[PDB]
Amino acid sequence: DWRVLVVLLPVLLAAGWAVRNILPYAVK
Amino acid sequence: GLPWYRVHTVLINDPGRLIAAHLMHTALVAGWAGSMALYELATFDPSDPVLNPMWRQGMFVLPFMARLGVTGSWSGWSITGETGIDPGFWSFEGVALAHIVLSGLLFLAACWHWVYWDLELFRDPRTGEPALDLPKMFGIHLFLAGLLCFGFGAFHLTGLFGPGMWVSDPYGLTGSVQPVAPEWGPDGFNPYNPGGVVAHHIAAGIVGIIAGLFHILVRPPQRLYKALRMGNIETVLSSSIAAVFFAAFVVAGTMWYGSATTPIELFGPTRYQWDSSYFQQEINRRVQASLASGATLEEAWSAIPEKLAFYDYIGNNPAKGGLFRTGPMNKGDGIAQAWKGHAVFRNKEGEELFVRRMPAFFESFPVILTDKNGVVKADIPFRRAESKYSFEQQGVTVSFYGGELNGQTFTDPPTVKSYARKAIFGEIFEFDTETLNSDGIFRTSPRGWFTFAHAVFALLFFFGHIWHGARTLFRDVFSGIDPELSPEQVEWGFYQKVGDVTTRR
Amino acid sequence: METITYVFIFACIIALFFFAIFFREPPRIT
Amino acid sequence: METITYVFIFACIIALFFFAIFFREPPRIT
Amino acid sequence: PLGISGTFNFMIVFQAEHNILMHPFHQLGVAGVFGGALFCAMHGSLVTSSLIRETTETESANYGYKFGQEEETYNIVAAHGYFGRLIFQYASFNNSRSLHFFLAAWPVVGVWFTA
Amino acid sequence: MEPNPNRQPVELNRTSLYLGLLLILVLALLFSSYFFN
Amino acid sequence: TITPSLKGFFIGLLSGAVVLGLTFAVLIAISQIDKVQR
Amino acid sequence: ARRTWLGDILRPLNSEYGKVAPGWGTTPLMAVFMGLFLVFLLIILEIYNSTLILDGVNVSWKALG
Amino acid sequence: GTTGERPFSDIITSVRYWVIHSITIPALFIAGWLFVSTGLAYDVFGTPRPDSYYAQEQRSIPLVTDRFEAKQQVETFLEQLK
Amino acid sequence: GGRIPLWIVATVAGMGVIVIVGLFFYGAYAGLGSSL
Amino acid sequence: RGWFDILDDWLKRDRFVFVGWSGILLFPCAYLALGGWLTGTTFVTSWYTHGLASSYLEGCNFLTVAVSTPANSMGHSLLLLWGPEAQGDFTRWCQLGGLWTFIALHGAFGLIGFMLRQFEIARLVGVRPYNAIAFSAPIAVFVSVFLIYPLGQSSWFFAPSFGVAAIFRFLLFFQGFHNWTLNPFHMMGVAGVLGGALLCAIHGATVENTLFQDGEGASTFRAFNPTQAEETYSMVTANRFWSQIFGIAFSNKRWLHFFMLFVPVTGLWMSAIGVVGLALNLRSYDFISQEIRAAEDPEFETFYTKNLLLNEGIRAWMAPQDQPHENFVFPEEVLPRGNAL
Amino acid sequence: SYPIFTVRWVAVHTLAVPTIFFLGAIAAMQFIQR
Amino acid sequence: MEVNQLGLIATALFVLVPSVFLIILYVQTESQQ
Amino acid sequence: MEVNQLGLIATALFVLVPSVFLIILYVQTESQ
Ligand code: CLA
Ligand code: CLA
Ligand code: CLA
Ligand code: CLA
Ligand code: CLA
Ligand code: CLA
Ligand SMILES: CC1=C(/C=C/C(C)=C/C=C/C(C)=C/C=C/C=C(C)/C=C/C=C(C)/C=C/C2=C(C)CCCC2(C)C)C(C)(C)CCC1
Ligand SMILES: CC1=C(/C=C/C(C)=C/C=C/C(C)=C/C=C/C=C(C)/C=C/C=C(C)/C=C/C2=C(C)CCCC2(C)C)C(C)(C)CCC1
Ligand SMILES: CCCCCCCCCCCCCCCCCC(=O)O
Ligand SMILES: [Fe+2]
């Protein structure tokens, strides 16, 4: 139901944010 | 010198004296078995298998002889109550004697192996040193185990060449030794199916023969030899203790929950039969059936066998004992003489009332009477001043059907209360408390004592397994760690792989 | 208990005989 | 009889304390 | 009371009148005493695990220590090397003084609270 | 046939004696009430 | 005669095999990439 | 060491101390049998536990007839 | 002394560390908040809401009393509140 | 690499725990579990 | 290099958290046991098994939350998620008590994993395995209390529930029903635990107050070096002090530290045995001689008889709410009560 | 250089990630009224 | 009081038999020198 | 048979104490 995406959105967005900020060094 | 806790380590590299010690242990154990049986024979009363069966009398090895087919005495009685039997040599007495003779013979062989310890058989032909080839010994002994397991199942338990084993009906009323046919289908894994025990021994015996043959012919892999220290007899002690505590937990559980090999006429009921009112349901089932085919109340209850009523009594529940309440169950509540009959309670309005039964957890329990719907209608009050439900106020009476008090009714409150105090225990029995100077306090059965002992020994053998497993794998540092162990091996990051000096950075 | 006690003592004596004969201190000439 | 037994064991423990303190194995250096 | 069953009577009455089990100072006493027993076993087993080999399999290892010898009888660096890997490096003491001060302080402070 | 080489002397020092006696006496002091019951 | 609980047993059995097989597949992979140099 | 007639007959059964098969030998086959036995014990446990319920398997005293 | 991972004190004083975690930490907090504020926690775990322990004229506990019908008993009790 | 002083990291983290814990003690007196 | 050996290499690399082969069993089981407890104490009720609230969500606090045992009606069911009781429904599994068996069983295998880790690391580092051996005591307590005890009883219901207050209730249950304080095996456990804490305190204090002056600072911690060979405190002065204060003292440092292992480990093992007895209601509940006298002599009173009255109070007053499946209805008039209270 | 992602990194986040989530959920609970 | 009369011999052997064992071992230790 | 109950402990101690005395003396004779 809808409440499950409400909950999961800050998680995915936080995960995305860290992905962007770290991708360059993870490559190395 | 050796500390006291290490004196038997002098056998580790002495196969002959190890054999001698093992022979002496085997002599002691067989001697105990014969001694215990003779003491039980000298104390056992065989005169009433109904209300004074072996398990009320504190018999411990008697049931194990009966389980496998020994049921009669040279004296002419049998545990099933038949008289004039002739058992032949394999009476209780003959089994006891055989174990004593066996003990004596093992003792003599122990002396011979102790003196003549230096047998060439125990020497490695290459090196001249004492050596046991444990991998091959295992295959030999496993092959033997499998042969004996198979024969036990194929001949003794089937009755092909043997007596069979104890079997009974589900209510423990008609037990006897019978041959048992194997159950090969999935119900053979049902702990309550005797034919599964037969099939187990046939199938597992064949597997043991085959595994044994494998282990005689195929050498252990190098990786496993080294990993398990298969040149070190203490690795066998470690794994053997492990197998033994595993076995001891299993027999503890099947003794406690019940299975086809722990029958209730030999060991007593289980606590779960009290928890689930197992016997009460069957009693009620039979009475309802007598009544619907036109029997009197008196007739229906009088048809209940006393042996079935005696199971429906908390004094035979194995979870009612105490650790230091010693001896037979008879020493507590007494020697059961007779079922008094089924007590029926009614109030002054003719309604039938039901005593709430004691659960096993409670050393003491109040006396509460309910109607068929669970509504409290009478009790024995503690504080009298605001009492609502006293027997005096509610006019409670008790009537008996069946048994010694059949057709009698009691109305004086003190007498009625007295039977209600006894009805919390289930069915009501007349006990002889004088013969044994019984103290009136419940003891546990052989089912309880066996379970206790085996669960405790199993737990302690777990420590043995840890101890000897540790000793096997850490033999090199038993006496202390390397005096020349340098900080590089235990400081961090020096080696990529902990303890491997070849992965230095 | 008293029967057990009498038999126990008797059994110890028989054991003593065994050790006294077969595990005696051997007499040596010297 | 039970009272005698309890006090007997207790008395043995007190006696053991005496020996353990005054008749100990003496700790000796190096 | 000055007696074994009298002690239990005192404990039971105390619980009915004070709910001592739900009192934080008693909970700290339990942590002091359970923790004291834990650290007793830990310390005894770590020192015992790292005794330096000074004896043979036929004699008690205790004879490897002589009263008043100047050298330590176990290898504390090996003990630390084991315990730091059992958990992680910085959860293990390498300073014997801090270690023995901790042993002293944990049960003393717990028992102060329960008193 | 040579005498058995695996024989070892056994020891119990005085301190172990005292420790073992204390253990036994205290165990007896503890269990005796339960034996008499 | 394949009852619900026998079906559940097989479900549990496969689930476990997946968990252990997946775990070991991953540990083998990592160990092969990131070796100790000797 | 003392030779005996029985010892001379049993001799070969205690003659291969330390002999091993190379490397891993039958270890993979052992692992298979261990795994089968685990499932088999699981089944037996869960039948006793009434977590595995099978047709015609009444895990009760009432299976004695 | 070290196994080659980066020192913690070096990480948590670093600018990049806090650029990431000033997002990820509040995000996780808010996710867990919403898990409760939306009522989802109740439904996932089956935990009664303050109005759902008893039926209106009921002081009997909905105690599971069968092993193999237990699932259905709970369901029966829940429908006694709809 | 070492930009933010650790004593500041510790003060702010420390205050953050005081806040959440304080909230939990507040909630002992309000709402569910308050006896009211 | 075979694949098995390369996995061995990787598992045994020196890293911040050592893994090992034991890690494959330990780390999932420990994290699942721990996560199950946090999950259940935060979100899951005990309404349908116990008639109790037991989670933060429901209003409980750190002292009263628990993961409670399953209902008595489950018997000793493994209560597998996919089993016949929950039938794969996670929600019902939670409501039926599945998290209890989940935590207990994962906890048990996690404990095994941890002791295997103690063995594994000890073998790699080259020390003797006595820390693993010592840990057998916590294992024996766990299995005897959380597993063997409920297996002898009617169901998991009567095991300890995983919570602070729930364990407090367990203590009190054992007093009122088992008279557990009277049990000599518990008494030996008490002596080993209290004796261990004493040894811990007295050894640490002794070392700290027999230190050698090995530096000029008023903080004496700085004057120790983990590679110094010298003892950092005086066994000789310690021995003299205790000999003169108490009569006896340690003289052998090895015996001293073995004794420290021995006392608490033995005590815990002894208590576990007593609990195995209580699995069967094989209690040390009574002294028969005392009961015979008291039944006959109404003026005979001891602290033993006084405590049984308390047990009787505990049982009658807590049973109806503590054992809801029994449907105990005790009218006011049958409750044991002294005067006025 | 230092690696970013390690076994250590996993162990830390295996615990830290759900801790913060639970803390947020338990914070929200303090405002639930009956 | 009506105690178990076998409690006496039980207690006596429980003390005596282990104690004698230790004394035997101690005295033969001393006479080794 | 209604025997004297103290007979058992009297007999047991009569055997045990003197016998233990001799065993103690013999064993320490052998170890020197
Ligand atoms: C047609 C073939 C056939 C048949 C019908 C049977 C029939 C049976 N087998 Mg056999 N078996 C066979 C072939 C067969 N077997 C073969 C080929 C082998 C290989 C050699 C075996 C090996 C085997 C073993 C090893 C066992 C059986 C057992 C049984 C019985 C199962 C019922 C029971 O009581 O389980 C009860 C036993 C269990 C449910 C197993 C319990 C497992 C425990 C839980 C493991 C964990 C223990 C752990 C250490 C506990 C510590 C902590 C604890 C306190 C929590 C039954 C008699 C069991 C038995 O003898 O029971 C008495 C048993 O243990 N069989
Ligand atoms: C020589 C043959 C022999 C025979 C026919 C008997 C017969 C008997 N004995 Mg005696 N006994 C003997 C030798 C013998 N005994 C010896 C040598 C000793 C000294 C150890 C004893 C010690 C002894 C004791 C202590 C007791 C008896 C008892 C009994 C009775 C019950 C037996 C029973 O329940 O076993 C049950 C046996 C088992 C359950 C064995 C299980 C074995 C495990 C499961 C094997 C482990 C696996 C295996 C190694 C490998 C498996 C591989 C597989 C694939 C095949 C019965 C009258 C009992 C009795 O009533 O005494 C009066 C009793 O309490 N016996
Ligand atoms: C597996 C073992 C086993 C089991 C289960 C039984 C079971 C039974 N026996 Mg048998 N018995 C056995 C072995 C066993 N026996 C052996 C080896 C002997 C020879 C001594 C006997 C001799 C025997 C006799 C002579 C009699 C029985 C009787 C009985 C019944 C009553 C038992 C009783 O009152 O226990 C009471 C149990 C206890 C009080 C528990 C003892 C607890 C110990 C002492 C704790 C010690 C702890 C330790 C010191 C701690 C130190 C550890 C650490 C600090 C270092 C019962 C059916 C009686 C009966 O009814 O016969 C018809 C009877 O008269 N037994
Ligand atoms: C088949 C089982 C078995 C066997 C063959 C052995 C054999 C051995 N053990 Mg292991 N052990 C076992 C089980 C076993 N143990 C179990 C179950 C445990 C846990 C209790 C241990 C714990 C253990 C430890 C901690 C140690 C040993 C040690 C030893 C070695 C020296 C033993 C000695 O001289 O004792 C001498 C013992 C005495 C002189 C007196 C013992 C008196 C006891 C306390 C009470 C008497 C019990 C009584 C006779 C009834 C026994 C019957 C019982 C089974 C019902 C020897 C190889 C020692 C070792 O490794 O040395 C290197 C050692 O330190 N064992
Ligand atoms: C070390 C890892 C580990 C261990 C020991 C356990 C142990 C356990 N778990 Mg846990 N679990 C783990 C990891 C682990 N878990 C992980 C990582 C998760 C997250 C996914 C879980 C999630 C989890 C849940 C949700 C539950 C358990 C449960 C259980 C219990 C029952 C397990 C069972 O029946 O297995 C059965 C399966 C096996 C033993 C696997 C054997 C492998 C077989 C032999 C091979 C199969 C061959 C294959 C099918 C053939 C292929 C052919 C192909 C062509 C088709 C037990 C305590 C249950 C529980 O706690 O009950 C209360 C439960 O409900 N576990
Ligand atoms: C002087 C007071 C006193 C003392 C010192 C003790 C001491 C003891 N009691 Mg007794 N008790 C007392 C009074 C006392 N009791 C009274 C008055 C009563 C009322 C009758 C009881 C009732 C009682 C009960 C009911 C029980 C005890 C038990 C015990 C033992 C607990 C052993 C232990 O550490 O378990 C702690 C648990 C373990 C060691 C298990 C393993 C734990 C693992 C390692 C945990 C790992 C945790 C994980 C890594 C981190 C979790 C994080 C999370 C918290 C956030 C110990 C001998 C227990 C016992 O005897 O057990 C055999 C027991 O069941 N006691
Ligand atoms: C020589 C000979 C002979 C004879 C023999 C004999 C006579 C035998 C006997 C034997 C016997 C007669 C034996 C017995 C044994 C016993 C034992 C071995 C016991 C044991 C015990 C125990 C071990 C105990 C323990 C305990 C206690 C005490 C307490 C409680 C707990 C317990 C149980 C632990 C003949 C003629 C044949 C021939 C020729 C040769
Ligand atoms: C169960 C389950 C599972 C799992 C799960 C998990 C794994 C979880 C986890 C979880 C988690 C992992 C959680 C966490 C939480 C946490 C918390 C909640 C915390 C809190 C804390 C606090 C509150 C603290 C405080 C404090 C104090 C008090 C003092 C000092 C300081 C501090 C701050 C520390 C699965 C899915 C498989 C499925 C089945 C079921
Ligand atoms: C030893 C490692 C074991 C790992 C276990 C992981 C378990 C994950 C299983 C979750 C699946 C639940 C599905 C439920 C479906 C049940 C259907 C039915 O009962 O008939
Ligand atoms: Fe120390």
Q: Mind giving me the DSSP string for chain E? A: --SHHHHHHHHHHHHHHH-GGG-HHHHHHHHHHHHHHHHHHHHHHHHHHTBBP-S-TTS-GGGG--TT-SB-SB-HHHHHHHHHHHS-GGGS---HHHHHHHHHHHHHHHHHHH-
Count: domains in chain G: 1
Write the single-letter amino acid at B409.
Answer: T
At L34 the three-state DSSP class reads coil
In this structure, the number of other CB atoms found within 10 A of the CB of residue M29 comes to 20
> What is the distance between the alpha carbons of residues E101 and K201, in angstroms, rounded to a whole number?
9
Site of tokens 């967005």: A13
Q: Are K122 and B481 in contact (CB under 8 A)?
A: no
Count: domains in chain K: 1
Distances (CA, A) of I81 to F28, I61, J5, K51, K95: 63, 13, 57, 17, 17
Helix boundaries (H) for K155-301: 164-178, 184-208, 235-246, 253-279, 288-296
In chain D, the largest separation of any two C-alpha atoms, in whole Å, equals 50
> What is the distance between the alpha carbons of residues I31 and I38, in angstroms, rounded to a whole number?
10
Q: Is K15 within the bounds of a domain?
A: no
Element containing residue B344 per DSSP (H, E): strand B335-346
Give the residue from I6, I8, I11, I12 with the most J CB atoms within 10 Å of its CB, the best one to mutate: I12
Which phi and psi (to 5°) does residue K70 adopt? -65, 165
Q: Are E26 and K171 in contact (CB under 8 A)?
A: no
Element containing residue I40 per DSSP (H, E): helix I40-45
Residue in chain D lying closest to K248 (CA):
D21
Q: What is the dihedral of CA F10, F11, F17, F23, to 10 degrees?
A: -50
DSSP string, B393-417: HHT-EEEEESSTTTT-EE-SHHHHH
Q: Are B399 and B346 in contact (CB under 8 A)?
A: yes
Distances (CA, A) of K155 to K31, K41, K279, K321: 26, 22, 11, 17
Residue in chain K lying closest to B370 (CA):
K329
Angle at CA of residue E79, ends K263 and L9, nearest 5°: 115
| Ligand 8 atom closest to Cα of residue K32 | 7
Q: For residue K242, with 0-12 CB atoms within 10 Å meaning exposed, 13-18 middle and 19 or more buried, which class applies? A: middle
Q: Is D touching A (3+ C-beta pairs, cut-off 8 A)?
A: no
Give the residue from I3, I17, I36, I54 with the most L CB atoms within 10 Å of its CB, the best one to mutate: I36
Angle at CA of residue B28, ends B24 and B29, nearest 5°: 120
- Facing residues of K67 across strands? K162
> What is the distance between the alpha carbons of residues K119 and K113, in angstroms, rounded to a whole number?
10
CA nearest neighbour of K79 among K59, K57, K96: K96
> What is the distance between the alpha carbons of residues B415 and B420, in angstroms, rounded to a whole number?
9
Nearest CA to ligand 6 atom 7: K190
Q: Which residues contact B365 (CB under 8 A, 6 or more apart)?
A: B356, B358, B359, B424
Element containing residue B167 per DSSP (H, E): strand B165-167
Q: Which residues from chain M sit within 8 angstroms of residue F20, using beta carbons?
A: 18, 22
CA nearest neighbour of K330 among K341, K317, K339: K317
> What is the distance between the alpha carbons of residues B401 and B406, in angstroms, rounded to a whole number?
4
Q: Give long-range contacts, CB 8 A cutoff, 24+ apart: G10-18.
A: G11/K82, G11/K88, G12/K80, G12/K82, G12/K83, G13/H39, G15/K82
Q: Which chains touch E (3 or more CB pairs under 8 A)?
A: B, D, K
In this structure, the number of other CB atoms found within 10 A of the CB of residue M6 comes to 17
I16 CB near a chain L CB, below 8 Å?
no
Kindly report the nearest CA distance between residue K276 and chain B, in angstroms: 7
Q: Are B447 and K281 in contact (CB under 8 A)?
A: no
Distances (CA, A) of K103 to B266, K34, M4: 38, 8, 45
> What is the distance between the alpha carbons of residues E30 and E20, in angstroms, rounded to a whole number?
11
Q: Is B367 within the bounds of a domain?
A: yes
Q: Is N touching K (3+ C-beta pairs, cut-off 8 A)?
A: no
Q: For residue H30, with 0-12 CB atoms within 10 Å meaning exposed, 13-18 middle and 19 or more buried, which class applies? A: middle
CA nearest neighbour of B438 among B55, B41, B57: B57
Q: Give long-range contacts, CB 8 A cutoff, 24+ apart: E11-18.
A: E11/K181, E12/K175, E12/K307, E12/K310, E13/K310, E15/K172
Which tokens sit at K287? 């002294």
Q: Is H63 within the bounds of a domain?
A: no
> What is the distance between the alpha carbons of residues E55 and B479, in angstroms, rounded to a whole number?
6
Q: Are I74 and I45 in contact (CB under 8 A)?
A: no
Q: Judge whether K228 is annotated as a binding position.
A: no
Specify the DSSP class assigned to residue B430: E
Write the single-letter amino acid at I80.
Answer: Q
Specify the DSSP class assigned to residue B361: T
Q: Are B30 and B103 in contact (CB under 8 A)?
A: yes
CA nearest neighbour of B58 among B402, B244, B297, B326: B326
Same domain, B279 and B291: yes
Q: β-strand B165-167 against B176-178: which pairing, if any?
A: antiparallel
The class of domain I6-82 in CATH terms is mainly alpha
Residues of B with CB under 8 A from a CB of G: 496-497, 500, 502-503
Contact A26 L5 (CB under 8 A): yes
I7 CB near a chain B CB, below 8 Å?
no
Q: Is B228 within the bounds of a domain?
A: yes
CA nearest neighbour of B498 among F30, K21, F6: K21
Which tokens sit at E62? 């205790």
- Return the HEC string of H24-58: CCCHHHHHHHHHHHHHHHHHHHHHHCCCCCCCCCC
> What is the distance between the alpha carbons of residues B435 and C5, in angstroms, rounded to a whole number?
24
Which tokens sit at B328? 């037979």
Q: Specify the experimental method.
A: X-ray
Q: Is the CB of B37 under 6 A from ligand 2?
A: yes
> What is the distance between the alpha carbons of residues G26 and K151, in angstroms, rounded to a whole number?
38
Q: Is the CB of B4 under 6 A from ligand 4?
A: yes
Count: domains in chain H: 1
Q: Which residues from chain K sit within 8 angstroms of residue G31, using beta carbons?
A: 6-7, 9-11
In b/e form, how buried is each residue of B201-212, taking b as 16+ CB within 10 angstroms? bbbbbbebbebb
Q: Are K149 and B483 in contact (CB under 8 A)?
A: no
Which of B132, B218, B225 is facing H14, going by the closest CB pair?
Answer: B132
Gyration radius of chain I's alpha carbons: 23
Which phi and psi (to 5°) does residue J30 adopt? -125, 140
> What is the distance between the alpha carbons of residues B19 and B110, in angstroms, rounded to a whole number?
7
Q: Judge whether L10 is annotated as a binding position.
A: no
Q: Is the CB of B327 under 6 A from ligand 3?
A: yes
* CATH number of the domain residue H42 falls in: 1.20.5.880
Rounded-to-5 percentages of helix, strand, coil across chain B: 50, 10, 40
Q: Are B135 and B230 in contact (CB under 8 A)?
A: yes
Which phi and psi (to 5°) does residue B353 adopt? -115, 155
CA nearest neighbour of K144 among K267, K33, K29, K273: K273
Q: Which chains touch G (3 or more CB pairs under 8 A)?
A: B, H, K
Element containing residue B287 per DSSP (H, E): helix B278-292
Nearest CA to ligand 5 atom 42: G17
Q: What residue segments make up the domains of chain J, in order of their start?
A: 1-36
In this structure, the number of other CB atoms found within 10 A of the CB of residue C28 comes to 5
Same domain, B439 and B458: no
Same domain, B362 and B407: yes
Which tokens sit at K105? 């069983």
> What is the distance between the alpha carbons of residues B203 and B184, in angstroms, rounded to a whole number?
9
Angle at CA of residue I17, ends I11 and I21, nearest 5°: 130
Contact I67 K85 (CB under 8 A): yes
Contact G6 H54 (CB under 8 A): yes
Identify each DSSP E strand in B173-237 by its residue range: 176-178
Which tokens sit at K246? 């108490």
> What is the distance between the alpha carbons of residues B319 and B316, in angstroms, rounded to a whole number?
9
Distance of CA B365 to the CA centre of its chain: 29
Residue K13, phi-psi category: left (phi > 0), alpha (psi -120 to 50), beta (remainder): beta
> What is the distance between the alpha carbons of residues K42 and K58, in angstroms, rounded to a whole number?
9
Count: domains in chain B: 2
At K337 the three-state DSSP class reads coil
Instruction: Provide the residue range defining the domain that includes B21.
Output: 1-270+444-480
Q: Which residues contact D27 (CB under 8 A, 6 or more apart)?
A: E67, K239, K243, K249, K251
Mutating to test ligand 9, I would choose from G19, G22, G23 the residue with most ligand atoms within 8 A of its C-beta, which is G19
In chain N, the largest separation of any two C-alpha atoms, in whole Å, equals 49
Which phi and psi (to 5°) does residue K233 adopt? -140, 165
CA nearest neighbour of B165 among B118, B201, B117: B201
Residue in chain I lying closest to J6 (CA):
I13
Q: Is B430 within the bounds of a domain?
A: yes
CA nearest neighbour of N31 among A3, M32, K19: M32
Which tokens sit at I52? 């759902």
Q: Are I36 and L25 in contact (CB under 8 A)?
A: yes
| Exposure of K45 in the CB half-sphere (CA atoms within 13 A) | 28
> What is the distance between the alpha carbons of residues K32 and G19, in angstroms, rounded to a whole number?
14
Distance of CA D14 to the CA centre of its chain: 5
Q: Is K257 within the bounds of a domain?
A: yes
Distances (CA, A) of K193 to F19, F26, K249, K255, K260: 19, 17, 21, 19, 11
| Exposure of K151 in the CB half-sphere (CA atoms within 13 A) | 24
Considering the four listed CATH numbers 3.30.413.10, 3.40.50.2000, 3.55.40.20, 6.10.250.2070, the one that applies to the domain covering J1-36 is: 6.10.250.2070
Helix boundaries (H) for B218-260: 222-227, 233-257
Angle at CA of residue B476, ends B474 and B481, nearest 5°: 90
Same domain, B42 and B180: yes
> What is the distance between the alpha carbons of residues M30 and K206, in angstroms, rounded to a whole number?
32
Same domain, B465 and B399: no
Q: Are B495 and K14 in contact (CB under 8 A)?
A: yes
Q: Which residues contact I36 (CB under 8 A, 6 or more apart)?
A: K57, L25, L28, L29, L32
CA nearest neighbour of K263 among K203, K184, K198: K198
Contact M28 N23 (CB under 8 A): no
Q: Are B139 and B214 in contact (CB under 8 A)?
A: yes
Q: Are K166 and K66 in contact (CB under 8 A)?
A: yes
Which tokens sit at I75? 């369901």
Give the residue from B474, B475, B503, B505 with the most K CB atoms within 10 Å of its CB, the best one to mutate: B474
Q: Could you report how far apart the first and last alpha carbons of chain M are, in Å? A: 50
Element containing residue B306 per DSSP (H, E): helix B306-311
Write the single-letter amino acid at H47.
Answer: I
Distance K99 CA to ligand 9 centre (A): 14
Write the single-letter amino acid at N14.
Answer: F
Contact K128 B477 (CB under 8 A): yes
CA nearest neighbour of I64 among I75, I51, I79, I48: I75
> What is the distance between the alpha carbons of residues K275 and B423, in angstroms, rounded to a whole number?
30
Q: Is K85 within the bounds of a domain?
A: yes
Gyration radius of chain M's alpha carbons: 15
Q: Which residues contact C28 (CB under 8 A, 6 or more apart)?
A: none
> What is the distance between the alpha carbons of residues B486 and E77, in angstroms, rounded to a whole number?
9
Q: Is H touching A (3+ C-beta pairs, cut-off 8 A)?
A: no
- Count chain A–chain I contacts defined by CB atoms under 8 A: 42
Q: What residue segments make up the domains of chain I, in order of their start?
A: 6-82
Q: Are B242 and B465 in contact (CB under 8 A)?
A: yes
Q: Is the CB of B65 under 6 A from ligand 2?
A: yes
Same domain, B439 and B469: no
Q: Are B501 and K150 in contact (CB under 8 A)?
A: no
Q: Which domains are seen in chain E, by residue range?
A: 24-115 (1.20.85.10)
Contact D13 F36 (CB under 8 A): no
> What is the distance between the alpha carbons of residues B436 and B443, in angstroms, rounded to a whole number?
14
DSSP string, K28-76: HHHHHHHHHHHHHHHH--BHHHHSB--SGGGT--TTT--BPPPPGGGTT
In chain H, the largest separation of any two C-alpha atoms, in whole Å, equals 63
> What is the distance between the alpha carbons of residues K331 and B337, in angstroms, rounded to a whole number?
36
Q: Are E71 and K235 in contact (CB under 8 A)?
A: no
Same domain, B51 and B115: yes
Which tokens sit at B53? 């069966």
I20 CB near a chain L CB, below 8 Å?
no
Q: Are B1 and F10 in contact (CB under 8 A)?
A: yes
> What is the distance between the alpha carbons of residues B50 and K104, in angstroms, rounded to a whole number?
43
Q: Is B226 within the bounds of a domain?
A: yes
- Facing residues of K52 across strands? K46
> What is the distance between the alpha carbons of residues A4 and K289, in angstroms, rounded to a whole number?
67
Instruction: Provide the residue range defining the domain that includes G17.
Output: 1-38
> What is the distance between the alpha carbons of residues B365 and B382, in angstroms, rounded to a whole number?
12
Q: Are E94 and K226 in contact (CB under 8 A)?
A: yes
Site of tokens 């003396």: N25
